[PDB]
Amino acid sequence: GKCRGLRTARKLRSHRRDQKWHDKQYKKAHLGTALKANPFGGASHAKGIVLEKVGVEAKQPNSAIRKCVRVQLIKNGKKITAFVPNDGCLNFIEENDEVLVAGFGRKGHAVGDIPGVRFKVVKVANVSLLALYKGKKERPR
Amino acid sequence: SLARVGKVRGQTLKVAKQEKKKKRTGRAKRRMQYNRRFVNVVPTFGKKKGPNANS
Amino acid sequence: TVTIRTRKFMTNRLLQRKQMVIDVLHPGKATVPKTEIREKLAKMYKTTPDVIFVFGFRTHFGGGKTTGFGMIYDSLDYAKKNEPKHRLARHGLYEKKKTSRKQRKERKNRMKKVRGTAKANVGA
Amino acid sequence: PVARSWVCRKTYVTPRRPFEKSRLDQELKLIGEYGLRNKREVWRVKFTLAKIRKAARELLTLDEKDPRRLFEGNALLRRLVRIGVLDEGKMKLDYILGLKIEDFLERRLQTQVFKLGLAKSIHHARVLIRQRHIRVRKQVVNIPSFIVRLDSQKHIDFSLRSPYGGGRPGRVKRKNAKKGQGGAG
RNA sequence: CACGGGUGACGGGGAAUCAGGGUUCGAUUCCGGAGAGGGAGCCUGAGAAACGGCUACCACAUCCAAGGAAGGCAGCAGGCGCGCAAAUUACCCACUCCCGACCCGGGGAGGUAGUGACGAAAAAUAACAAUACAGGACUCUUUCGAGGCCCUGUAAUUGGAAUGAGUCCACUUUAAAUCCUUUAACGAGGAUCCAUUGGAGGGCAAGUCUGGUGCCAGCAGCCGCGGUAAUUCCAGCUCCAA
Ligand SMILES: [Mg+2]
Ligand SMILES: [Mg+2]
Ligand SMILES: [Mg+2]
Ligand SMILES: [Mg+2]
Ligand SMILES: [Mg+2]
Ligand SMILES: [Mg+2]
Ligand SMILES: [Mg+2]
Ligand SMILES: [Mg+2]
Ligand SMILES: [Mg+2]
Ligand SMILES: [Mg+2]
Ligand SMILES: [Mg+2]
Ligand SMILES: [Mg+2]
Ligand SMILES: [Mg+2]
Ligand SMILES: [Mg+2]
Ligand SMILES: [Mg+2]
Ligand SMILES: [Mg+2]
Ligand SMILES: [Mg+2]
Ligand SMILES: [Mg+2]
């Protein structure tokens, strides 16, 4: 601190209270602009209906097509490109399926090669995409 | 284009998994691990090798 | 080979009973049944077995010792007077009816519908 | 409102660095030397020993001849003397800080059964405890982490219902006699 | 720092993390408050502006012969909906207590079971012995080698010994049960009675092993890897962490 007087506790507490708002991690939590902008809304997962399967070109040096999925959520109606992680797991996903969609692990940030995808697909029609990949469960038909 | 989904995982050579004597588990696994760490090998000269170091 | 000792003895004059912590030792067999407990309390305190009420056994781990509770009344006109009815129904001297609790509530709400003497005629 | 406790406490703490090569070099000696089952058994003895040292530092900051520091200090020494980790002449609360994890793993019943010589190996002793072969003062103990007090160390022996003690043979030898008597007739 | 506004604001005892300070949470079993779809008004009563009490209006909604009548699960179970997100339309007043004219009656309060990997505690999935073998402090030997008072380890080599998990009578438990504990009878050698989950370039413990792919498929929290010899993808073996 700078003002060290013995009865300056309102000068100090109201200066941390002012200057906490210049912290980027603090203001995002304590303004409602970022919770409104979050397509989940302070949730960790969201079911959503697939409406098309989208190929996303990767960024710089990496040259690949990232196999993503245009998801429209149930709870909001908001539209989202979510990612499909493992190899060949886009073929399990048919159109018009309720898929469970998580984050990517970076708390609202684009991750790695993919430009502007914040979300990945966990389950495909109440069957996990891991068990579809491994072969433990089968797509229910 | 999304035509190449499942390319490499589809075209790999399908290798059947080898059968194997099952590993002991629990303190017995940890015991066999302790023996292959400490009580067997001796200090020798030069740079020492790894647990899976093959060449 | 079954030895039974008593701990924490007390005479209840205001309940007309004895009371003790039964300590059964059976190293070599199962938890010995309560019929065999009452007959051995009978020869220990020189009393009849019908005034003896014994309950609450939990056998230790390892199993060479248990711990139970017991009361010994003066007569059956005390042992039926101050005693829980479920422990009088164990030996055979008390009988509850076979109407269950949901049939009793369902009739009480039907008897609440009907006014007068016809409350006796609601059920059956 | 239900009438039940919900008072529960974790008895271990996982360490701050997950993949130190030197901590795994250290803690895996403790499992081999003392026949333990996992790292959580190592991690829970370090956490009890941290609690005793944490209460030890809290008493050393108190002034000498404090009415709390004498009573809490005498109790904490007695609780370490009776288990047999602290020496009965060394009972002074400044020596609790000079105390390490291998001293608790000695007073474990699995290592006492090994050091009393009624066990073949450290890993044989834990098979004896799990199969209800040994007792401590007419009480069959089934659990190897039993902290044997100094008072009750000289009473460890085989349980009375055990073929390793004076009892019936096991399932196996009863069947080996039955096929032997089945073979002869 | 009034007044106004927002609160993903019921307050507190408390909880999580923590050197010392602190930061965040506290709908949630204890204390206080508020409310019974939304507001409003009353009657009886010591005590209610009561909703498992009435009276209206609004919303929702059931029976009808169309004149009327009936309602309030944010009690306990349960159902629909909403969702990322949460249990049986079970048994009993035996325990704790409550109420009543009362030792007797009643209590979805409460107790006990069923679902339960929210979470916490304890804790099996082998141990031993003998054969080959690989080694070590002795003694001998220049080394080569060797004897065993003594070890330590490995191997679908062999051997009987100990046990639960389970099967199943019986007690005990209990209101009646179920479970734990006690206990006969069965129950183990590839002890098939089979432990997974993630990873192996660096951070970060652990292979420049082999096959396929050829900036593709894909991996990658970050740096980065893949452009026909990939320590980084897809597989097998092996190893590593819990
Ligand atoms: Mg870059
Ligand atoms: Mg508000
Ligand atoms: Mg609120
Ligand atoms: Mg609260
Ligand atoms: Mg009210
Ligand atoms: Mg409602
Ligand atoms: Mg009202
Ligand atoms: Mg109601
Ligand atoms: Mg009420
Ligand atoms: Mg849950
Ligand atoms: Mg009751
Ligand atoms: Mg009554
Ligand atoms: Mg209840
Ligand atoms: Mg197993
Ligand atoms: Mg690999
Ligand atoms: Mg790494
Ligand atoms: Mg490394
Ligand atoms: Mg990697």
PDB file of N, CA and C (backbone and C1' of nucleotides) in Angstrom, chain C residues 26 29-35 55-63 86 90 96 100-102 104-105 108, chain E residues 52 89-95 103 106-108 110 170-177 179-184:
ATOM      1  N   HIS C  26     -19.210 -68.503  24.032  1.00  0.00           N
ATOM      2  CA  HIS C  26     -19.294 -69.769  23.308  1.00  0.00           C
ATOM      3  C   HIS C  26     -18.163 -69.986  22.299  1.00  0.00           C
ATOM      4  N   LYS C  29     -18.846 -72.591  18.746  1.00  0.00           N
ATOM      5  CA  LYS C  29     -20.109 -72.788  18.057  1.00  0.00           C
ATOM      6  C   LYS C  29     -20.722 -71.436  17.725  1.00  0.00           C
ATOM      7  N   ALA C  30     -21.937 -71.486  17.186  1.00  0.00           N
ATOM      8  CA  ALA C  30     -22.664 -70.293  16.784  1.00  0.00           C
ATOM      9  C   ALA C  30     -23.157 -69.521  18.004  1.00  0.00           C
ATOM     10  N   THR C  31     -23.820 -68.398  17.737  1.00  0.00           N
ATOM     11  CA  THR C  31     -24.442 -67.632  18.806  1.00  0.00           C
ATOM     12  C   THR C  31     -25.601 -68.441  19.366  1.00  0.00           C
ATOM     13  N   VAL C  32     -25.505 -68.829  20.633  1.00  0.00           N
ATOM     14  CA  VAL C  32     -26.418 -69.836  21.184  1.00  0.00           C
ATOM     15  C   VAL C  32     -27.798 -69.220  21.385  1.00  0.00           C
ATOM     16  N   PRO C  33     -28.878 -69.941  21.088  1.00  0.00           N
ATOM     17  CA  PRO C  33     -30.194 -69.299  20.994  1.00  0.00           C
ATOM     18  C   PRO C  33     -30.745 -68.899  22.352  1.00  0.00           C
ATOM     19  N   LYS C  34     -31.705 -67.969  22.310  1.00  0.00           N
ATOM     20  CA  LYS C  34     -32.174 -67.313  23.527  1.00  0.00           C
ATOM     21  C   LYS C  34     -32.992 -68.254  24.398  1.00  0.00           C
ATOM     22  N   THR C  35     -33.521 -69.330  23.810  1.00  0.00           N
ATOM     23  CA  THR C  35     -34.173 -70.363  24.606  1.00  0.00           C
ATOM     24  C   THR C  35     -33.168 -71.065  25.508  1.00  0.00           C
ATOM     25  N   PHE C  55     -32.760 -60.288  25.553  1.00  0.00           N
ATOM     26  CA  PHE C  55     -32.716 -59.669  24.232  1.00  0.00           C
ATOM     27  C   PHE C  55     -31.413 -58.890  24.070  1.00  0.00           C
ATOM     28  N   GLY C  56     -31.035 -58.661  22.814  1.00  0.00           N
ATOM     29  CA  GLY C  56     -29.989 -57.701  22.493  1.00  0.00           C
ATOM     30  C   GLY C  56     -28.595 -58.263  22.327  1.00  0.00           C
ATOM     31  N   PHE C  57     -28.452 -59.383  21.624  1.00  0.00           N
ATOM     32  CA  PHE C  57     -27.133 -59.988  21.496  1.00  0.00           C
ATOM     33  C   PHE C  57     -26.400 -59.512  20.249  1.00  0.00           C
ATOM     34  N   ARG C  58     -25.162 -59.071  20.455  1.00  0.00           N
ATOM     35  CA  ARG C  58     -24.258 -58.779  19.350  1.00  0.00           C
ATOM     36  C   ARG C  58     -22.935 -59.475  19.629  1.00  0.00           C
ATOM     37  N   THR C  59     -22.589 -60.436  18.781  1.00  0.00           N
ATOM     38  CA  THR C  59     -21.373 -61.211  18.963  1.00  0.00           C
ATOM     39  C   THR C  59     -20.166 -60.422  18.471  1.00  0.00           C
ATOM     40  N   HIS C  60     -19.076 -60.477  19.237  1.00  0.00           N
ATOM     41  CA  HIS C  60     -17.845 -59.783  18.884  1.00  0.00           C
ATOM     42  C   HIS C  60     -17.209 -60.368  17.626  1.00  0.00           C
ATOM     43  N   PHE C  61     -16.263 -59.626  17.062  1.00  0.00           N
ATOM     44  CA  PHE C  61     -15.460 -60.158  15.975  1.00  0.00           C
ATOM     45  C   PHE C  61     -14.432 -61.124  16.553  1.00  0.00           C
ATOM     46  N   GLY C  62     -14.249 -62.263  15.894  1.00  0.00           N
ATOM     47  CA  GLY C  62     -13.500 -63.352  16.490  1.00  0.00           C
ATOM     48  C   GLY C  62     -14.402 -64.391  17.125  1.00  0.00           C
ATOM     49  N   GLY C  63     -15.392 -63.942  17.888  1.00  0.00           N
ATOM     50  CA  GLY C  63     -16.490 -64.795  18.302  1.00  0.00           C
ATOM     51  C   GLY C  63     -16.216 -65.761  19.432  1.00  0.00           C
ATOM     52  N   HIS C  86     -44.100 -56.504  22.038  1.00  0.00           N
ATOM     53  CA  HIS C  86     -43.430 -57.258  20.987  1.00  0.00           C
ATOM     54  C   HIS C  86     -42.527 -58.329  21.577  1.00  0.00           C
ATOM     55  N   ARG C  90     -42.952 -62.773  21.462  1.00  0.00           N
ATOM     56  CA  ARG C  90     -41.883 -63.633  20.965  1.00  0.00           C
ATOM     57  C   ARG C  90     -42.083 -65.073  21.398  1.00  0.00           C
ATOM     58  N   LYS C  96     -50.852 -60.196  17.913  1.00  0.00           N
ATOM     59  CA  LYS C  96     -51.412 -59.066  17.196  1.00  0.00           C
ATOM     60  C   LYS C  96     -52.261 -59.551  16.024  1.00  0.00           C
ATOM     61  N   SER C 100     -53.055 -54.960   8.348  1.00  0.00           N
ATOM     62  CA  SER C 100     -51.833 -54.177   8.248  1.00  0.00           C
ATOM     63  C   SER C 100     -52.143 -52.688   8.289  1.00  0.00           C
ATOM     64  N   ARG C 101     -51.078 -51.890   8.341  1.00  0.00           N
ATOM     65  CA  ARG C 101     -51.183 -50.478   8.690  1.00  0.00           C
ATOM     66  C   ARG C 101     -51.831 -49.663   7.580  1.00  0.00           C
ATOM     67  N   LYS C 102     -51.660 -50.087   6.329  1.00  0.00           N
ATOM     68  CA  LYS C 102     -52.265 -49.355   5.224  1.00  0.00           C
ATOM     69  C   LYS C 102     -53.762 -49.632   5.131  1.00  0.00           C
ATOM     70  N   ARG C 104     -55.544 -49.972   7.750  1.00  0.00           N
ATOM     71  CA  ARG C 104     -56.151 -49.253   8.866  1.00  0.00           C
ATOM     72  C   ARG C 104     -56.336 -47.781   8.536  1.00  0.00           C
ATOM     73  N   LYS C 105     -55.380 -47.196   7.813  1.00  0.00           N
ATOM     74  CA  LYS C 105     -55.493 -45.798   7.422  1.00  0.00           C
ATOM     75  C   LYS C 105     -56.544 -45.608   6.344  1.00  0.00           C
ATOM     76  N   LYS C 108     -59.981 -45.591   7.978  1.00  0.00           N
ATOM     77  CA  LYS C 108     -60.200 -44.405   8.801  1.00  0.00           C
ATOM     78  C   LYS C 108     -60.530 -43.193   7.940  1.00  0.00           C
TER      79      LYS C 108
ATOM     80  P     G E  52     -51.868 -26.217   5.386  1.00  0.00           P
ATOM     81  O5'   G E  52     -52.978 -27.355   5.361  1.00  0.00           O
ATOM     82  C5'   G E  52     -53.979 -27.405   4.357  1.00  0.00           C
ATOM     83  C4'   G E  52     -54.606 -28.771   4.288  1.00  0.00           C
ATOM     84  C3'   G E  52     -55.336 -29.230   5.539  1.00  0.00           C
ATOM     85  O3'   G E  52     -56.663 -28.735   5.601  1.00  0.00           O
ATOM     86  C1'   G E  52     -53.861 -30.926   4.831  1.00  0.00           C
ATOM     87  P     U E  89     -42.368 -48.299  -6.597  1.00  0.00           P
ATOM     88  O5'   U E  89     -43.554 -47.306  -6.255  1.00  0.00           O
ATOM     89  C5'   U E  89     -44.327 -47.479  -5.082  1.00  0.00           C
ATOM     90  C4'   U E  89     -44.956 -46.181  -4.661  1.00  0.00           C
ATOM     91  C3'   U E  89     -45.966 -46.271  -3.533  1.00  0.00           C
ATOM     92  O3'   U E  89     -45.336 -46.262  -2.265  1.00  0.00           O
ATOM     93  C1'   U E  89     -46.784 -44.876  -5.291  1.00  0.00           C
ATOM     94  P     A E  90     -46.119 -46.760  -0.956  1.00  0.00           P
ATOM     95  O5'   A E  90     -45.227 -47.961  -0.405  1.00  0.00           O
ATOM     96  C5'   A E  90     -45.151 -49.194  -1.105  1.00  0.00           C
ATOM     97  C4'   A E  90     -44.223 -50.168  -0.422  1.00  0.00           C
ATOM     98  C3'   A E  90     -44.432 -50.350   1.070  1.00  0.00           C
ATOM     99  O3'   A E  90     -45.485 -51.253   1.358  1.00  0.00           O
ATOM    100  C1'   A E  90     -42.123 -50.084   0.609  1.00  0.00           C
ATOM    101  P     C E  91     -46.359 -51.113   2.700  1.00  0.00           P
ATOM    102  O5'   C E  91     -45.348 -51.490   3.870  1.00  0.00           O
ATOM    103  C5'   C E  91     -45.087 -52.843   4.209  1.00  0.00           C
ATOM    104  C4'   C E  91     -44.248 -52.936   5.459  1.00  0.00           C
ATOM    105  C3'   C E  91     -44.814 -52.248   6.688  1.00  0.00           C
ATOM    106  O3'   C E  91     -45.790 -53.001   7.373  1.00  0.00           O
ATOM    107  C1'   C E  91     -42.555 -51.635   6.424  1.00  0.00           C
ATOM    108  P     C E  92     -47.004 -52.236   8.088  1.00  0.00           P
ATOM    109  O5'   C E  92     -46.352 -51.598   9.391  1.00  0.00           O
ATOM    110  C5'   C E  92     -45.877 -52.433  10.431  1.00  0.00           C
ATOM    111  C4'   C E  92     -45.042 -51.679  11.437  1.00  0.00           C
ATOM    112  C3'   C E  92     -45.758 -50.619  12.249  1.00  0.00           C
ATOM    113  O3'   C E  92     -46.518 -51.157  13.312  1.00  0.00           O
ATOM    114  C1'   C E  92     -43.679 -49.780  11.501  1.00  0.00           C
ATOM    115  P     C E  93     -47.964 -50.552  13.623  1.00  0.00           P
ATOM    116  O5'   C E  93     -47.660 -49.045  14.024  1.00  0.00           O
ATOM    117  C5'   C E  93     -47.713 -48.630  15.381  1.00  0.00           C
ATOM    118  C4'   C E  93     -46.333 -48.461  15.960  1.00  0.00           C
ATOM    119  C3'   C E  93     -46.288 -47.784  17.320  1.00  0.00           C
ATOM    120  O3'   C E  93     -45.193 -48.303  18.056  1.00  0.00           O
ATOM    121  C1'   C E  93     -45.057 -46.506  15.769  1.00  0.00           C
ATOM    122  P     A E  94     -45.404 -49.513  19.082  1.00  0.00           P
ATOM    123  O5'   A E  94     -43.990 -49.610  19.795  1.00  0.00           O
ATOM    124  C5'   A E  94     -43.574 -50.784  20.463  1.00  0.00           C
ATOM    125  C4'   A E  94     -42.114 -51.036  20.213  1.00  0.00           C
ATOM    126  C3'   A E  94     -41.202 -49.830  20.337  1.00  0.00           C
ATOM    127  O3'   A E  94     -40.853 -49.537  21.676  1.00  0.00           O
ATOM    128  C1'   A E  94     -40.687 -51.016  18.362  1.00  0.00           C
ATOM    129  P     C E  95     -40.630 -48.019  22.145  1.00  0.00           P
ATOM    130  O5'   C E  95     -39.320 -47.550  21.375  1.00  0.00           O
ATOM    131  C5'   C E  95     -38.037 -47.983  21.799  1.00  0.00           C
ATOM    132  C4'   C E  95     -36.936 -47.196  21.135  1.00  0.00           C
ATOM    133  C3'   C E  95     -36.971 -45.694  21.355  1.00  0.00           C
ATOM    134  O3'   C E  95     -36.340 -45.322  22.568  1.00  0.00           O
ATOM    135  C1'   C E  95     -36.623 -46.169  19.055  1.00  0.00           C
ATOM    136  P     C E 103     -53.544 -42.396  32.102  1.00  0.00           P
ATOM    137  O5'   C E 103     -52.466 -43.357  31.433  1.00  0.00           O
ATOM    138  C5'   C E 103     -51.258 -42.832  30.893  1.00  0.00           C
ATOM    139  C4'   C E 103     -50.353 -43.911  30.348  1.00  0.00           C
ATOM    140  C3'   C E 103     -50.990 -44.888  29.359  1.00  0.00           C
ATOM    141  O3'   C E 103     -50.075 -45.188  28.306  1.00  0.00           O
ATOM    142  C1'   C E 103     -50.093 -46.076  31.215  1.00  0.00           C
ATOM    143  P     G E 106     -53.899 -46.675  17.116  1.00  0.00           P
ATOM    144  O5'   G E 106     -53.509 -45.252  16.535  1.00  0.00           O
ATOM    145  C5'   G E 106     -54.431 -44.521  15.746  1.00  0.00           C
ATOM    146  C4'   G E 106     -53.968 -43.105  15.543  1.00  0.00           C
ATOM    147  C3'   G E 106     -52.594 -42.936  14.930  1.00  0.00           C
ATOM    148  O3'   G E 106     -52.566 -43.118  13.530  1.00  0.00           O
ATOM    149  C1'   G E 106     -52.782 -41.519  16.783  1.00  0.00           C
ATOM    150  P     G E 107     -51.252 -43.728  12.850  1.00  0.00           P
ATOM    151  O5'   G E 107     -50.241 -42.507  12.800  1.00  0.00           O
ATOM    152  C5'   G E 107     -50.568 -41.310  12.116  1.00  0.00           C
ATOM    153  C4'   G E 107     -49.625 -40.199  12.495  1.00  0.00           C
ATOM    154  C3'   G E 107     -48.166 -40.434  12.184  1.00  0.00           C
ATOM    155  O3'   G E 107     -47.859 -40.235  10.823  1.00  0.00           O
ATOM    156  C1'   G E 107     -48.362 -39.564  14.353  1.00  0.00           C
ATOM    157  P     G E 108     -47.665 -41.507   9.879  1.00  0.00           P
ATOM    158  O5'   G E 108     -46.623 -41.033   8.790  1.00  0.00           O
ATOM    159  C5'   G E 108     -45.326 -40.582   9.157  1.00  0.00           C
ATOM    160  C4'   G E 108     -44.534 -40.178   7.943  1.00  0.00           C
ATOM    161  C3'   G E 108     -44.864 -38.802   7.377  1.00  0.00           C
ATOM    162  O3'   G E 108     -43.692 -38.267   6.773  1.00  0.00           O
ATOM    163  C1'   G E 108     -45.334 -40.439   5.760  1.00  0.00           C
ATOM    164  P     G E 110     -38.572 -36.201   9.742  1.00  0.00           P
ATOM    165  O5'   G E 110     -38.199 -37.404  10.711  1.00  0.00           O
ATOM    166  C5'   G E 110     -37.569 -37.189  11.966  1.00  0.00           C
ATOM    167  C4'   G E 110     -37.817 -38.353  12.879  1.00  0.00           C
ATOM    168  C3'   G E 110     -37.255 -39.674  12.409  1.00  0.00           C
ATOM    169  O3'   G E 110     -35.866 -39.797  12.650  1.00  0.00           O
ATOM    170  C1'   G E 110     -39.472 -39.994  13.085  1.00  0.00           C
ATOM    171  P     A E 170     -33.105 -72.454   7.905  1.00  0.00           P
ATOM    172  O5'   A E 170     -32.171 -72.517   9.200  1.00  0.00           O
ATOM    173  C5'   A E 170     -32.324 -73.554  10.159  1.00  0.00           C
ATOM    174  C4'   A E 170     -31.395 -73.397  11.338  1.00  0.00           C
ATOM    175  C3'   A E 170     -31.586 -72.170  12.205  1.00  0.00           C
ATOM    176  O3'   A E 170     -32.708 -72.274  13.059  1.00  0.00           O
ATOM    177  C1'   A E 170     -29.279 -72.552  11.868  1.00  0.00           C
ATOM    178  P     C E 171     -33.547 -70.963  13.461  1.00  0.00           P
ATOM    179  O5'   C E 171     -32.463 -69.996  14.113  1.00  0.00           O
ATOM    180  C5'   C E 171     -32.560 -69.611  15.473  1.00  0.00           C
ATOM    181  C4'   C E 171     -31.208 -69.514  16.131  1.00  0.00           C
ATOM    182  C3'   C E 171     -30.874 -68.176  16.759  1.00  0.00           C
ATOM    183  O3'   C E 171     -31.495 -67.979  18.016  1.00  0.00           O
ATOM    184  C1'   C E 171     -29.007 -68.967  15.548  1.00  0.00           C
ATOM    185  P     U E 172     -32.396 -66.677  18.263  1.00  0.00           P
ATOM    186  O5'   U E 172     -31.351 -65.485  18.276  1.00  0.00           O
ATOM    187  C5'   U E 172     -30.282 -65.447  19.208  1.00  0.00           C
ATOM    188  C4'   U E 172     -29.233 -64.476  18.745  1.00  0.00           C
ATOM    189  C3'   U E 172     -29.751 -63.105  18.351  1.00  0.00           C
ATOM    190  O3'   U E 172     -29.998 -62.247  19.449  1.00  0.00           O
ATOM    191  C1'   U E 172     -28.324 -63.895  16.665  1.00  0.00           C
ATOM    192  P     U E 173     -31.369 -61.417  19.514  1.00  0.00           P
ATOM    193  O5'   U E 173     -31.196 -60.296  18.399  1.00  0.00           O
ATOM    194  C5'   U E 173     -30.113 -59.379  18.436  1.00  0.00           C
ATOM    195  C4'   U E 173     -29.892 -58.737  17.088  1.00  0.00           C
ATOM    196  C3'   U E 173     -31.051 -57.920  16.549  1.00  0.00           C
ATOM    197  O3'   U E 173     -31.128 -56.619  17.105  1.00  0.00           O
ATOM    198  C1'   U E 173     -30.259 -59.355  14.856  1.00  0.00           C
ATOM    199  P     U E 174     -32.195 -56.317  18.263  1.00  0.00           P
ATOM    200  O5'   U E 174     -33.291 -55.410  17.555  1.00  0.00           O
ATOM    201  C5'   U E 174     -33.032 -54.799  16.306  1.00  0.00           C
ATOM    202  C4'   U E 174     -34.116 -55.114  15.311  1.00  0.00           C
ATOM    203  C3'   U E 174     -35.528 -55.146  15.857  1.00  0.00           C
ATOM    204  O3'   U E 174     -36.081 -53.869  16.059  1.00  0.00           O
ATOM    205  C1'   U E 174     -35.181 -56.992  14.423  1.00  0.00           C
ATOM    206  P     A E 175     -36.920 -53.587  17.394  1.00  0.00           P
ATOM    207  O5'   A E 175     -38.403 -53.980  16.991  1.00  0.00           O
ATOM    208  C5'   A E 175     -39.325 -54.428  17.967  1.00  0.00           C
ATOM    209  C4'   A E 175     -40.613 -54.882  17.332  1.00  0.00           C
ATOM    210  C3'   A E 175     -40.494 -56.033  16.349  1.00  0.00           C
ATOM    211  O3'   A E 175     -40.503 -57.286  17.010  1.00  0.00           O
ATOM    212  C1'   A E 175     -41.865 -54.315  15.440  1.00  0.00           C
ATOM    213  P     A E 176     -39.577 -58.495  16.511  1.00  0.00           P
ATOM    214  O5'   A E 176     -40.028 -58.744  15.006  1.00  0.00           O
ATOM    215  C5'   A E 176     -41.205 -59.478  14.716  1.00  0.00           C
ATOM    216  C4'   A E 176     -41.439 -59.572  13.231  1.00  0.00           C
ATOM    217  C3'   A E 176     -40.238 -59.976  12.395  1.00  0.00           C
ATOM    218  O3'   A E 176     -40.001 -61.375  12.392  1.00  0.00           O
ATOM    219  C1'   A E 176     -41.254 -58.094  11.421  1.00  0.00           C
ATOM    220  P     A E 177     -38.497 -61.928  12.501  1.00  0.00           P
ATOM    221  O5'   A E 177     -37.684 -60.990  11.505  1.00  0.00           O
ATOM    222  C5'   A E 177     -36.922 -61.533  10.438  1.00  0.00           C
ATOM    223  C4'   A E 177     -37.230 -60.845   9.129  1.00  0.00           C
ATOM    224  C3'   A E 177     -36.032 -60.572   8.241  1.00  0.00           C
ATOM    225  O3'   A E 177     -35.678 -61.701   7.466  1.00  0.00           O
ATOM    226  C1'   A E 177     -37.341 -58.614   8.416  1.00  0.00           C
ATOM    227  P     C E 179     -29.470 -61.267   4.922  1.00  0.00           P
ATOM    228  O5'   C E 179     -28.370 -60.150   5.210  1.00  0.00           O
ATOM    229  C5'   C E 179     -27.794 -59.403   4.148  1.00  0.00           C
ATOM    230  C4'   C E 179     -27.077 -58.169   4.640  1.00  0.00           C
ATOM    231  C3'   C E 179     -25.891 -58.414   5.546  1.00  0.00           C
ATOM    232  O3'   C E 179     -24.729 -58.793   4.838  1.00  0.00           O
ATOM    233  C1'   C E 179     -27.225 -56.687   6.458  1.00  0.00           C
ATOM    234  P     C E 180     -23.778 -59.938   5.429  1.00  0.00           P
ATOM    235  O5'   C E 180     -23.051 -59.225   6.649  1.00  0.00           O
ATOM    236  C5'   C E 180     -22.174 -58.138   6.424  1.00  0.00           C
ATOM    237  C4'   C E 180     -21.790 -57.454   7.708  1.00  0.00           C
ATOM    238  C3'   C E 180     -21.090 -58.310   8.743  1.00  0.00           C
ATOM    239  O3'   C E 180     -19.712 -58.489   8.473  1.00  0.00           O
ATOM    240  C1'   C E 180     -22.770 -57.016   9.790  1.00  0.00           C
ATOM    241  P     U E 181     -19.064 -59.957   8.515  1.00  0.00           P
ATOM    242  O5'   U E 181     -19.134 -60.360  10.052  1.00  0.00           O
ATOM    243  C5'   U E 181     -18.430 -59.606  11.022  1.00  0.00           C
ATOM    244  C4'   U E 181     -18.886 -59.922  12.421  1.00  0.00           C
ATOM    245  C3'   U E 181     -18.830 -61.377  12.830  1.00  0.00           C
ATOM    246  O3'   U E 181     -17.524 -61.823  13.145  1.00  0.00           O
ATOM    247  C1'   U E 181     -20.880 -60.456  13.528  1.00  0.00           C
ATOM    248  P     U E 182     -17.048 -63.282  12.682  1.00  0.00           P
ATOM    249  O5'   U E 182     -17.994 -64.267  13.497  1.00  0.00           O
ATOM    250  C5'   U E 182     -17.873 -64.379  14.904  1.00  0.00           C
ATOM    251  C4'   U E 182     -18.825 -65.393  15.479  1.00  0.00           C
ATOM    252  C3'   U E 182     -18.800 -66.768  14.850  1.00  0.00           C
ATOM    253  O3'   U E 182     -17.684 -67.551  15.218  1.00  0.00           O
ATOM    254  C1'   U E 182     -21.032 -66.113  15.185  1.00  0.00           C
ATOM    255  P     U E 183     -16.962 -68.447  14.101  1.00  0.00           P
ATOM    256  O5'   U E 183     -18.073 -69.508  13.683  1.00  0.00           O
ATOM    257  C5'   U E 183     -18.487 -70.514  14.591  1.00  0.00           C
ATOM    258  C4'   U E 183     -19.632 -71.327  14.047  1.00  0.00           C
ATOM    259  C3'   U E 183     -19.337 -72.155  12.817  1.00  0.00           C
ATOM    260  O3'   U E 183     -18.615 -73.333  13.116  1.00  0.00           O
ATOM    261  C1'   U E 183     -21.442 -71.095  12.588  1.00  0.00           C
ATOM    262  P     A E 184     -17.262 -73.658  12.323  1.00  0.00           P
ATOM    263  O5'   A E 184     -17.569 -75.045  11.614  1.00  0.00           O
ATOM    264  C5'   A E 184     -18.541 -75.120  10.587  1.00  0.00           C
ATOM    265  C4'   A E 184     -19.567 -76.183  10.871  1.00  0.00           C
ATOM    266  C3'   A E 184     -19.778 -77.190   9.754  1.00  0.00           C
ATOM    267  O3'   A E 184     -18.838 -78.248   9.787  1.00  0.00           O
ATOM    268  C1'   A E 184     -21.867 -76.354  10.445  1.00  0.00           C
TER     269        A E 184
END
